[PDB]
Tab-separated table of C-alpha atoms and ligand atoms in Angstrom:
chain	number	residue	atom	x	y	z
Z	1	UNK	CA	-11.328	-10.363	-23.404
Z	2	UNK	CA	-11.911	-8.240	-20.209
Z	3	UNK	CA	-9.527	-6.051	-18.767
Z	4	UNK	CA	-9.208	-5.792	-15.448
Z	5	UNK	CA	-6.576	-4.284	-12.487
Z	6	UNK	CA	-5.600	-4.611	-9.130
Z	7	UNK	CA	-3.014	-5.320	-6.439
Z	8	UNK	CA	-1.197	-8.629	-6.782
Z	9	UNK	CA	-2.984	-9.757	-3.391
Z	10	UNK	CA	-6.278	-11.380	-2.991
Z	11	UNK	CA	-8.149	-8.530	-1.674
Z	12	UNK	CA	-11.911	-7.022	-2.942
Z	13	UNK	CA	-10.740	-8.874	-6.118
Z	14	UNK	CA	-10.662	-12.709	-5.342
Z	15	UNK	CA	-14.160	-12.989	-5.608
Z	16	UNK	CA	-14.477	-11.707	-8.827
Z	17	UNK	CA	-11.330	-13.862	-10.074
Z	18	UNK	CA	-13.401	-16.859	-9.165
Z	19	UNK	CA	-16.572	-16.110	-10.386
Z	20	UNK	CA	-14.862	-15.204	-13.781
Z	21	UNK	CA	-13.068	-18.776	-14.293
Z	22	UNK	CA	-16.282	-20.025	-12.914
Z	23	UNK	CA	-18.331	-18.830	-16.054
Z	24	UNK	CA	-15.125	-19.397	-18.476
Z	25	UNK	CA	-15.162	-15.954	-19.177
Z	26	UNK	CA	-12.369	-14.740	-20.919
Z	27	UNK	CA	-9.879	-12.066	-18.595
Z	28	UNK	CA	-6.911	-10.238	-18.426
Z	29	UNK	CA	-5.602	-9.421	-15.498
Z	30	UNK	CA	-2.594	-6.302	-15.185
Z	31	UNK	CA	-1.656	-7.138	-11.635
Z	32	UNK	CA	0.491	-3.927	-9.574
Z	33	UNK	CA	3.421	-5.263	-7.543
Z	34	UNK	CA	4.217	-3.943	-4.135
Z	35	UNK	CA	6.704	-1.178	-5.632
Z	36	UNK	CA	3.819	0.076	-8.158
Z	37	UNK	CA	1.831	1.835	-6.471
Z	38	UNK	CA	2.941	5.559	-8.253
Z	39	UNK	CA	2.779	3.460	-11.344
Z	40	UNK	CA	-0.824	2.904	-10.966
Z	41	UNK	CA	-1.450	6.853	-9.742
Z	42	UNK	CA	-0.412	7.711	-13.067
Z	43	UNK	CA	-2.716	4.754	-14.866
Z	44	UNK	CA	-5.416	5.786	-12.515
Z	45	UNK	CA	-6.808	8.970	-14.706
Z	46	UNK	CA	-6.003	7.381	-17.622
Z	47	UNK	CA	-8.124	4.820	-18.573
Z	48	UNK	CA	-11.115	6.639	-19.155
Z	49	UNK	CA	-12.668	5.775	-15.515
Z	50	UNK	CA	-15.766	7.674	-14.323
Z	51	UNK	CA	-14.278	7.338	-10.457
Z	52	UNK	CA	-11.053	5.726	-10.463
Z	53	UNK	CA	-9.895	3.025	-8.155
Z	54	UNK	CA	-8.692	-0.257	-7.981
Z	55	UNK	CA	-10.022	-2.588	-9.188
Z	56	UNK	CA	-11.655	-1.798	-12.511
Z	57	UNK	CA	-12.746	-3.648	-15.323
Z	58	UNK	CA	-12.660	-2.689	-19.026
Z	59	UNK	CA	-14.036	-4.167	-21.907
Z	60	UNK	CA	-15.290	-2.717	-25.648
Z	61	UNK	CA	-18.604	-2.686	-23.574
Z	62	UNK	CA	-17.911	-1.152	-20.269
Z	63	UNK	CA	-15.753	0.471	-18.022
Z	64	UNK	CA	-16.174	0.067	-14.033
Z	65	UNK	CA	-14.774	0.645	-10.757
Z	66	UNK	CA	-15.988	-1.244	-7.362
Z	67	UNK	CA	-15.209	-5.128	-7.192
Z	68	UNK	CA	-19.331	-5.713	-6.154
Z	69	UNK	CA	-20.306	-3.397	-9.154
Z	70	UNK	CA	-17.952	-5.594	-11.139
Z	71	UNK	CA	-18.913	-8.968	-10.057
Z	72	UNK	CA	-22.419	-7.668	-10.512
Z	73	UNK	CA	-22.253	-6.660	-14.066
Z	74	UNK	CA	-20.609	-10.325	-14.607
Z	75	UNK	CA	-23.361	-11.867	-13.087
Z	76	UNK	CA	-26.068	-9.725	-14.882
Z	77	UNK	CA	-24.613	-11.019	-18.082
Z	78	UNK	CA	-25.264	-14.538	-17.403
Z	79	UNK	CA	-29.116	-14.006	-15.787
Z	80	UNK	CA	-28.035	-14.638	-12.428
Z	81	UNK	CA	-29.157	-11.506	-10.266
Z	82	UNK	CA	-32.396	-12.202	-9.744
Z	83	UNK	CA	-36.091	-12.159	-11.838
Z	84	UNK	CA	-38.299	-10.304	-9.235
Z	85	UNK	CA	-37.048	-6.590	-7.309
Z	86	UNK	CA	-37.329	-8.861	-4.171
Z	87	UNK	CA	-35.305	-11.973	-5.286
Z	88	UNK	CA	-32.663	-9.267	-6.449
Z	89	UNK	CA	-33.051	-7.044	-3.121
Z	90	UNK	CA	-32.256	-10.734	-0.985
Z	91	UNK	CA	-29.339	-11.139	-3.158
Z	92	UNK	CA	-27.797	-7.446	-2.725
Z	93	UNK	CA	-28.618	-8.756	0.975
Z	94	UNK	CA	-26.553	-11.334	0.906
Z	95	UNK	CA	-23.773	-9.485	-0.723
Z	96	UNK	CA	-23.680	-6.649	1.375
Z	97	UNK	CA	-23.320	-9.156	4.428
Z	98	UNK	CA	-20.476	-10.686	2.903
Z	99	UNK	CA	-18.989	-7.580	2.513
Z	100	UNK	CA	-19.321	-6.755	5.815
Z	101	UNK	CA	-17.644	-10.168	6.595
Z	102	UNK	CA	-14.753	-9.618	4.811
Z	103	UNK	CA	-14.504	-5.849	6.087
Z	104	UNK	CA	-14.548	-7.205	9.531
Z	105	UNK	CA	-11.202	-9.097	8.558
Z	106	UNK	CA	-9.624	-5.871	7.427
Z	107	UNK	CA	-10.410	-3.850	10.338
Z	108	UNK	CA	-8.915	-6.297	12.947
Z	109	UNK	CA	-6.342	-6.701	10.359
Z	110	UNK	CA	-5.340	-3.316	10.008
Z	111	UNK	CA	-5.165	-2.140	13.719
Z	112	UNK	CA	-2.113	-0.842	14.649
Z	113	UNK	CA	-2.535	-2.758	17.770
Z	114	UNK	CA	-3.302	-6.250	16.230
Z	115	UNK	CA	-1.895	-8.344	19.017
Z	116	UNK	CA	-4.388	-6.609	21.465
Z	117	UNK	CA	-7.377	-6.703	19.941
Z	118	UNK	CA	-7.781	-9.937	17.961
Z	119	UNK	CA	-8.671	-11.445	21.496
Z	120	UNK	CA	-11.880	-9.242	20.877
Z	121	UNK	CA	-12.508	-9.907	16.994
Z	122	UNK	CA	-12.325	-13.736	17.276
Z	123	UNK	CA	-14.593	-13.624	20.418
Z	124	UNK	CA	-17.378	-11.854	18.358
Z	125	UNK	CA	-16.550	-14.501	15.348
Z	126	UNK	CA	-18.432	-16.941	16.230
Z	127	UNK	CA	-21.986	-15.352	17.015
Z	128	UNK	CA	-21.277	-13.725	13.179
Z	129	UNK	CA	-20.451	-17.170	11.642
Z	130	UNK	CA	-23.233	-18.886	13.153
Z	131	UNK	CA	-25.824	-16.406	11.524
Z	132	UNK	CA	-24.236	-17.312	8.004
Z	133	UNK	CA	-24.207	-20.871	9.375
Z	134	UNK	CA	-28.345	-20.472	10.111
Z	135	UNK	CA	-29.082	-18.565	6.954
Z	136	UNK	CA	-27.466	-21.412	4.846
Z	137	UNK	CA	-29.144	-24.013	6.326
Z	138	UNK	CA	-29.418	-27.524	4.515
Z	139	UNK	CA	-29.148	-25.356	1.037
Z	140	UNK	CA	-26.027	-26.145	-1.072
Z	141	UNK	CA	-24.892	-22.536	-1.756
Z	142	UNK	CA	-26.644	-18.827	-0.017
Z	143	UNK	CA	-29.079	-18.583	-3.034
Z	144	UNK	CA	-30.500	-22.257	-3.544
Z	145	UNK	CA	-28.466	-25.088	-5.381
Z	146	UNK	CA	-27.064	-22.809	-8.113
Z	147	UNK	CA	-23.649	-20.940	-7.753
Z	148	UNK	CA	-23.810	-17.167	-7.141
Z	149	UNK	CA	-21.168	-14.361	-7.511
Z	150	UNK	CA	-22.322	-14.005	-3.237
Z	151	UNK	CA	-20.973	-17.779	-2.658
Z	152	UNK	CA	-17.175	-16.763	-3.808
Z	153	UNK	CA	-17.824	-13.228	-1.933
Z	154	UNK	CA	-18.548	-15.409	1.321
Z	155	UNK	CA	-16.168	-17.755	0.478
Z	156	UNK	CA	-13.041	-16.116	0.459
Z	157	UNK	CA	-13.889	-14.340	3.484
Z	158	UNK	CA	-14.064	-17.511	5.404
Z	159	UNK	CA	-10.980	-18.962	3.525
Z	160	UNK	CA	-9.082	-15.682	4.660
Z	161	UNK	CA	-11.210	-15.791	8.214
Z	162	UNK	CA	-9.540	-19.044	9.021
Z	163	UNK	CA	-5.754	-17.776	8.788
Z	164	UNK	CA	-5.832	-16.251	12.013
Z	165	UNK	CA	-8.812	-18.823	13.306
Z	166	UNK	CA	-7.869	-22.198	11.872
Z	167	UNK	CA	-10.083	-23.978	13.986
Z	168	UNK	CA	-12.853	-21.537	13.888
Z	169	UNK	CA	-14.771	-23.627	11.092
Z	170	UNK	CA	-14.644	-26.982	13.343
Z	171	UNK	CA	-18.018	-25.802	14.962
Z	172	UNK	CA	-19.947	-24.987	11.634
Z	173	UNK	CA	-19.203	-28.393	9.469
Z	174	UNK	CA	-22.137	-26.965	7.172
Z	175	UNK	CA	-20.095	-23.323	6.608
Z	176	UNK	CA	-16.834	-26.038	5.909
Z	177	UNK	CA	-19.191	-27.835	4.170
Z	178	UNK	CA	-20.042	-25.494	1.968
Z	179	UNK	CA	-16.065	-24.307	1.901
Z	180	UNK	CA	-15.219	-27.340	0.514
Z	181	UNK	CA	-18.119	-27.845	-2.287
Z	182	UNK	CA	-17.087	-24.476	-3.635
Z	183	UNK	CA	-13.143	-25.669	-3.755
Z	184	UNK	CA	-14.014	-29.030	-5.290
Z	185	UNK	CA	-16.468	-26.461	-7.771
Z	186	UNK	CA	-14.344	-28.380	-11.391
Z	187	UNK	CA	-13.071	-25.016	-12.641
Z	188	UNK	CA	-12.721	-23.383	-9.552
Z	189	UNK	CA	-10.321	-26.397	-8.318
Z	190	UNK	CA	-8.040	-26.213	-11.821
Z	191	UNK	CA	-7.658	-22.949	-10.946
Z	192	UNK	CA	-6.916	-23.114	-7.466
Z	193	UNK	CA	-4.217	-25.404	-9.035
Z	194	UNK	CA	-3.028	-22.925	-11.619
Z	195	UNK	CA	0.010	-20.867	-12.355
Z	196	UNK	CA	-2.511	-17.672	-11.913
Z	197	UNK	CA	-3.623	-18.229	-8.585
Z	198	UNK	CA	-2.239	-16.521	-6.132
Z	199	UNK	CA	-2.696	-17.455	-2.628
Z	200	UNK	CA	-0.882	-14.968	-0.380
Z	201	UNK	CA	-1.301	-11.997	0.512
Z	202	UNK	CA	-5.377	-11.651	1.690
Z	203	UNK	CA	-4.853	-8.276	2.290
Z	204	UNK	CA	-2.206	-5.166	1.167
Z	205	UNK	CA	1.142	-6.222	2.087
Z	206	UNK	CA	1.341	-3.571	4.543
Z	207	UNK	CA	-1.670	-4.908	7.300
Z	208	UNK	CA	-0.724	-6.272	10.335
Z	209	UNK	CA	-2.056	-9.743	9.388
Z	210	UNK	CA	-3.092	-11.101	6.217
Z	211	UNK	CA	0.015	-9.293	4.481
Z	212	UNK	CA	3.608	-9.457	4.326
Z	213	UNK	CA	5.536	-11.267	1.511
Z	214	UNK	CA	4.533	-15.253	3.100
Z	215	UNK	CA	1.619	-17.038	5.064
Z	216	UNK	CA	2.060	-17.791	8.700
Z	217	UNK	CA	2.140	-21.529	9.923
B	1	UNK	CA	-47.683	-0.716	4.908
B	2	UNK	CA	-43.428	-0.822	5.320
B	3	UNK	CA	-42.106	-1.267	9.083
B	4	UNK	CA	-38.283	-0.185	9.400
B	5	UNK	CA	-35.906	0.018	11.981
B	6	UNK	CA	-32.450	1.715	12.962
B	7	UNK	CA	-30.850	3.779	16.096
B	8	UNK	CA	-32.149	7.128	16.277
B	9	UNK	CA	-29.014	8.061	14.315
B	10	UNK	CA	-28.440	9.681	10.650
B	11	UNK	CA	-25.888	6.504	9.964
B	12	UNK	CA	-26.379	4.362	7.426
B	13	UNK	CA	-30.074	4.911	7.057
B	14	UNK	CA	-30.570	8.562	5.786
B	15	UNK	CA	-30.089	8.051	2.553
B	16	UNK	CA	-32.889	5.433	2.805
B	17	UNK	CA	-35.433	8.029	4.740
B	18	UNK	CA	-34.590	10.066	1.669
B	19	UNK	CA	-35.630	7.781	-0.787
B	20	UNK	CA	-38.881	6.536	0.892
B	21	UNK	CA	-40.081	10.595	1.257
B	22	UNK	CA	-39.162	11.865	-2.064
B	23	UNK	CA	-40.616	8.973	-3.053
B	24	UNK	CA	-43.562	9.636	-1.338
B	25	UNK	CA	-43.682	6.026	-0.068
B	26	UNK	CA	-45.619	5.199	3.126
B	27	UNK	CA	-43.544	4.107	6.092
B	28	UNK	CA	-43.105	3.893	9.413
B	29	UNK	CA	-39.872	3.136	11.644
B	30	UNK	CA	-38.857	1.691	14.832
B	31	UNK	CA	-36.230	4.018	16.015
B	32	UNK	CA	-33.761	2.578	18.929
B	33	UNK	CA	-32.768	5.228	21.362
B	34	UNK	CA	-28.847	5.123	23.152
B	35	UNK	CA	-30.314	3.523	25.797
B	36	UNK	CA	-31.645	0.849	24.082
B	37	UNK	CA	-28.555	-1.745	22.734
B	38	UNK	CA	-30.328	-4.153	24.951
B	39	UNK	CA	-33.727	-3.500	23.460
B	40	UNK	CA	-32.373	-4.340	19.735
B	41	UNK	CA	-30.733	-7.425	21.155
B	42	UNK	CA	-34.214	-8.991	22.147
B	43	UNK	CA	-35.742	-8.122	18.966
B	44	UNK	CA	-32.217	-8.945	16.912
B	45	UNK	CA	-33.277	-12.392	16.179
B	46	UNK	CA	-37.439	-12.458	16.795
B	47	UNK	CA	-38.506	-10.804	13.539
B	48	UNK	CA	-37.732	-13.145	10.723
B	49	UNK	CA	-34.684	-11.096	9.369
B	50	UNK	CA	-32.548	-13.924	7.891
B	51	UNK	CA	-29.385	-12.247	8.349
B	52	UNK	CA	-30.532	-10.060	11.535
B	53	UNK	CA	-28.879	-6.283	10.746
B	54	UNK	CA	-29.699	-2.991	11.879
B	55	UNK	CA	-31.179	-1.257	9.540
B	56	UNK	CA	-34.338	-3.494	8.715
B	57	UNK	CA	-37.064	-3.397	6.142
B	58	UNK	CA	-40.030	-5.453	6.505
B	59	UNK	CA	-43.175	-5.614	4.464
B	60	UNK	CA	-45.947	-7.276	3.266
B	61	UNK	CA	-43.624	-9.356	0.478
B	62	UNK	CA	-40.214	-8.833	2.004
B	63	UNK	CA	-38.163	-8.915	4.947
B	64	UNK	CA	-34.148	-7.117	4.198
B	65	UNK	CA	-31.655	-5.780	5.968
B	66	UNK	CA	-28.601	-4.026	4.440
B	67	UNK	CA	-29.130	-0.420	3.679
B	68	UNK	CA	-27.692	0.105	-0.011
B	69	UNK	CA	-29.872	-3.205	-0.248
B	70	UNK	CA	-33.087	-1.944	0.962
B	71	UNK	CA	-33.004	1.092	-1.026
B	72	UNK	CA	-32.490	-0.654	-4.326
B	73	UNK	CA	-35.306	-2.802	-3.186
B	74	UNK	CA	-37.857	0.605	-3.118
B	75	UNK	CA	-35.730	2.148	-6.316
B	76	UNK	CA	-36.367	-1.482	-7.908
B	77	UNK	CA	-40.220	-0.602	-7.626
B	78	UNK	CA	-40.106	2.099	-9.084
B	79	UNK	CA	-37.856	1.261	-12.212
B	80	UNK	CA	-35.438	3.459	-10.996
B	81	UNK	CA	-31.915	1.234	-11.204
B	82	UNK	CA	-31.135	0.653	-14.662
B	83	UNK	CA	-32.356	-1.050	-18.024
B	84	UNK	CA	-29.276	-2.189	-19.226
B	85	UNK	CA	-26.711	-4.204	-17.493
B	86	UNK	CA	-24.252	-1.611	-18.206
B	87	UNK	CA	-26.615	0.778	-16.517
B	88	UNK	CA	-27.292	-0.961	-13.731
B	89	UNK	CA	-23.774	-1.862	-13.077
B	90	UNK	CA	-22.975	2.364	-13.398
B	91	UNK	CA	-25.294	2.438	-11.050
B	92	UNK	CA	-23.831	-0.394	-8.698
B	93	UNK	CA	-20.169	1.697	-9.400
B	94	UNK	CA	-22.027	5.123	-8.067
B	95	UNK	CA	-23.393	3.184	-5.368
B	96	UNK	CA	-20.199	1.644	-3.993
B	97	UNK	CA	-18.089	5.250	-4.451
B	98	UNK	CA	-20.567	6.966	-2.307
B	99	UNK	CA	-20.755	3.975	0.707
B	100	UNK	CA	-16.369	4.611	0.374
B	101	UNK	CA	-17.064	8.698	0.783
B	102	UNK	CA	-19.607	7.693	3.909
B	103	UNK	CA	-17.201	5.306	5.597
B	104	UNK	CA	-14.312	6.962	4.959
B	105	UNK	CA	-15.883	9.779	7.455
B	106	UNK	CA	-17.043	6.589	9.537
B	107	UNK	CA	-13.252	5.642	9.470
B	108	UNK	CA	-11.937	8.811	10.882
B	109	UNK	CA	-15.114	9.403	13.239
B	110	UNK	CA	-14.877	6.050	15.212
B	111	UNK	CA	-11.198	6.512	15.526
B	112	UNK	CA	-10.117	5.827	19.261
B	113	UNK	CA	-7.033	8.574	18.633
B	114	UNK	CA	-9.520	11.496	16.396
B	115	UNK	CA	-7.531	14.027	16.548
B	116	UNK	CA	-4.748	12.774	15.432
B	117	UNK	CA	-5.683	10.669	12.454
B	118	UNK	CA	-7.639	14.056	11.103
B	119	UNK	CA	-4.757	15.346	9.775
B	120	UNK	CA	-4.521	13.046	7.346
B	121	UNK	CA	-8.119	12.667	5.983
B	122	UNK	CA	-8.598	16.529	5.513
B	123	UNK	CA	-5.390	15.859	3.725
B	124	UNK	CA	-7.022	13.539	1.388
B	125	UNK	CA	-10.291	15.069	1.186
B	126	UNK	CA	-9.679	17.256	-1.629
B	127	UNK	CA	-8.604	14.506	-4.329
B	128	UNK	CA	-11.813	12.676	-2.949
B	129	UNK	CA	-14.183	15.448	-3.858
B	130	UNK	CA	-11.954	16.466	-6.792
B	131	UNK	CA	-13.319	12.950	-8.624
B	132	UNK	CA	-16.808	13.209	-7.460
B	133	UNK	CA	-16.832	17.100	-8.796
B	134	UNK	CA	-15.244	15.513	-12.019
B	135	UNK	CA	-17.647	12.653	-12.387
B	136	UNK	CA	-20.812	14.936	-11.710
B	137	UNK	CA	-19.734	17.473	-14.286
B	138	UNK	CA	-22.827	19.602	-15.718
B	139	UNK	CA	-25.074	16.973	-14.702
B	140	UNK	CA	-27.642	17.884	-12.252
B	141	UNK	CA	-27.675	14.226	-10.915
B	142	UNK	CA	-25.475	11.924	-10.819
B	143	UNK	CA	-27.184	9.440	-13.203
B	144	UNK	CA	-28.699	12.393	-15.141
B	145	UNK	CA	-31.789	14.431	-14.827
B	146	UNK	CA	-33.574	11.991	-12.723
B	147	UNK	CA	-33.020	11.182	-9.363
B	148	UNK	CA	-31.422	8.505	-7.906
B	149	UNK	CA	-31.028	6.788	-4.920
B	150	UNK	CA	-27.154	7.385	-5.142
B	151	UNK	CA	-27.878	11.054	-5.040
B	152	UNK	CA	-29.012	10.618	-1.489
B	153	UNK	CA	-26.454	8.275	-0.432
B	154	UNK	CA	-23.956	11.163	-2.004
B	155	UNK	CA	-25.796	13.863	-0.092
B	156	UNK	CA	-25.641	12.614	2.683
B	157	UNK	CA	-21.926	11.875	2.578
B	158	UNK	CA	-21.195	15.195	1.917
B	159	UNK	CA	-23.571	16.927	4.357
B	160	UNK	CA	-21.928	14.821	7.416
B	161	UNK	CA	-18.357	15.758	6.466
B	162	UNK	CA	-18.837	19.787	6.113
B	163	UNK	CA	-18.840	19.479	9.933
B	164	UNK	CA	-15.579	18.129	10.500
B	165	UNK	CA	-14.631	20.145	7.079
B	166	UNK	CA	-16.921	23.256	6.568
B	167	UNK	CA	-14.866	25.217	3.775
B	168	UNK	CA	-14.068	21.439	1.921
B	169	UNK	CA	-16.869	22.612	-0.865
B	170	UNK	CA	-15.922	26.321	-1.664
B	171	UNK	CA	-13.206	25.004	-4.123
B	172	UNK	CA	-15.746	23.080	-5.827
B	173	UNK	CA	-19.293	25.144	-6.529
B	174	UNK	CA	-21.006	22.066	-8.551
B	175	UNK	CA	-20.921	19.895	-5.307
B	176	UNK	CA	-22.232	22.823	-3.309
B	177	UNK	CA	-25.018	23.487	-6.089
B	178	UNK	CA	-25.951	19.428	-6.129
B	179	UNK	CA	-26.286	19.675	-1.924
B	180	UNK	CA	-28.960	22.799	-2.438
B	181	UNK	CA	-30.745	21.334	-5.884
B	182	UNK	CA	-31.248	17.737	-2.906
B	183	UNK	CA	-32.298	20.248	-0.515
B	184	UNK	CA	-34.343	22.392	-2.613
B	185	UNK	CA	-36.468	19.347	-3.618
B	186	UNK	CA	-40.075	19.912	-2.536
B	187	UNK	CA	-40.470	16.865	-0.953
B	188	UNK	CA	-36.967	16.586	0.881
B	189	UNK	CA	-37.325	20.283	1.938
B	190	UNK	CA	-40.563	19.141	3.727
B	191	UNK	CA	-39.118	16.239	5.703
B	192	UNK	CA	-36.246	18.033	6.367
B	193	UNK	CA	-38.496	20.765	7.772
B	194	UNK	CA	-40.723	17.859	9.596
B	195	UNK	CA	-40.363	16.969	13.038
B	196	UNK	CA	-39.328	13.344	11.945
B	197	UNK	CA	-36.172	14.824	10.509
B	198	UNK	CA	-32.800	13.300	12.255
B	199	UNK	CA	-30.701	16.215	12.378
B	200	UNK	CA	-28.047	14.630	14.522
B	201	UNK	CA	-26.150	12.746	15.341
B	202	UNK	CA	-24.614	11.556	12.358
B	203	UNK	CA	-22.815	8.381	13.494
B	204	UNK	CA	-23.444	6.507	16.322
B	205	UNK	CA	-23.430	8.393	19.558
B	206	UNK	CA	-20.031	6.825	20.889
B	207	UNK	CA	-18.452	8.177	18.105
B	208	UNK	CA	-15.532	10.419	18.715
B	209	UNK	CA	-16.655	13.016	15.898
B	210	UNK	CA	-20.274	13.483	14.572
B	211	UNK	CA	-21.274	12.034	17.984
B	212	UNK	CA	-23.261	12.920	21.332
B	213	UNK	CA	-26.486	13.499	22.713
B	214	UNK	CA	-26.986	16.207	20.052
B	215	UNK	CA	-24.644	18.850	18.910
B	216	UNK	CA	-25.102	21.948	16.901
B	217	UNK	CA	-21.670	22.071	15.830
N	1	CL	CL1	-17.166	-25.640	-12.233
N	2	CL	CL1	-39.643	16.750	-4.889
């Protein structure tokens, strides 16, 4: 199997947790506690990494840093990045939106003044969720009616999104919608299910929100 | 035959400039001015951009935004991103390192309390460069003896942050030679030379460091 690394949180790496028990591939996982961090500074130069950093991947094949380069390589195994430079171009698109997305929940998350300023974030979510909401349209997923690594990118960021906005979907039934056909996805909901999922915390244990040792209600 | 767009800012859009003239691709770009948020906001959604960004690429086949996105689209054409998936997801690692190295400046530039939270990034800096030195080794690319689109990205990166840290490349002399060999390059000396050169400023204007109307040092 792969070999990959990370904090045990969701993180940069959910996405590419999902879109691996999507395709059935095979995966290890060596997941770093909240008390390993100098245990990982002294795995770090040590695995034969170009440019170290969490998370990697490594196979007989490969070895990788950066969860999109990751996903990426995943995806370009199974034909699914694109057959044209502009049908590939759309897709990095795509992805680096949903990046953005998710960055936008760490920034807000991350502020040392979080109860000040999320007035401000969640005021700005909307116009951002209606442009994903426009650019899905009537489509089943962001690329057509097949599954892309950029659906579980966008995904989790709205899954995480709607921990400090629970009600923040209830205008965009087509972005819930499309929340809900990736759940009910048959491999994706076993594993949702499973003893490997792990549902808390979205970000580093140390943010402001999104961490800590348990969800808020 | 390509229309772009961007503020009249370095940003996120040098390394595509870059590209397009060592490329010797034709272009021509829309370049909003400070005063003009409220000029981008009337042509934000009125071009056909399906996720409406700043920077933009639109041509006759394509319409993009995303930066890292739009220059894989012009490295794409030219069969410059890979021809493995192993390769290309290399690539895709490079790629992702070198956006981290540019926002980790954006990170400390855009920070409401600068001089403050300085301290800790010149602290860091070092190991940062220390890897990228590593990776580059005796290459003089950082794919090989080719250029890449990462190699602008990178140069960039490292030409913004010598002006919040001008001695942060004397420890390491490969760096410094990869910055001249970018420089040195016929076509990049040209534009650089050219009155449609963006010299400064390297982030946004509002920025607390790399910032203002225009500031040699
Ligand atoms: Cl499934
Ligand atoms: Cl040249």
């Amino acid at each position: 199997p792969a070999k990959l690394g990370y904090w045990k949180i969701r993180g940069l790496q959910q996405p590419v947790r999902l879109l691996l028990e999507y395709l059935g591939e095979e995966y290890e996982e060596h997941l770093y506690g909240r008390d390993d961090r100098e245990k990982w500074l002294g795995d770090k130069f040590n695995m034969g990494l170009d440019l170290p950093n969490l998370p990697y991947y490594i196979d007989d094949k490969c070895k990788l840093t950066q969860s999109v380069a990751i996903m990426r390589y995943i995806a370009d195994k199974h034909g699914m990045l694109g057959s044209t430079p502009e049908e590939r171009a759309r897709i990095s698109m795509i992805e680096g939106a949903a990046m953005d997305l998710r960055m936008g929940f760490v920034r807000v998350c991350y502020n040392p003044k979080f109860e000040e300023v999320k007035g401000d974030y969640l005021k700005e979510l909307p116009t951002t969720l209606k442009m994903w909401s426009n650019f899905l349209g009537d489509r089943h997923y962001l690329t057509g009616s097949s599954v892309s690594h950029v659906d579980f990118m966008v995904y989790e960021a709205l899954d995480c999104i709607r921990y400090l906005a629970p009600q923040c979907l209830e205008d965009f039934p087509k972005l819930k919608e499309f929340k809900s056909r990736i759940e009910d996805l048959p491999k994706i909901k076993a594993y949702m299910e499973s003893e490997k999922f792990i549902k808390w915390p979205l970000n580093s244990w140390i943010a402001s929100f999104g961490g800590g040792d348990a969800a808020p209600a």
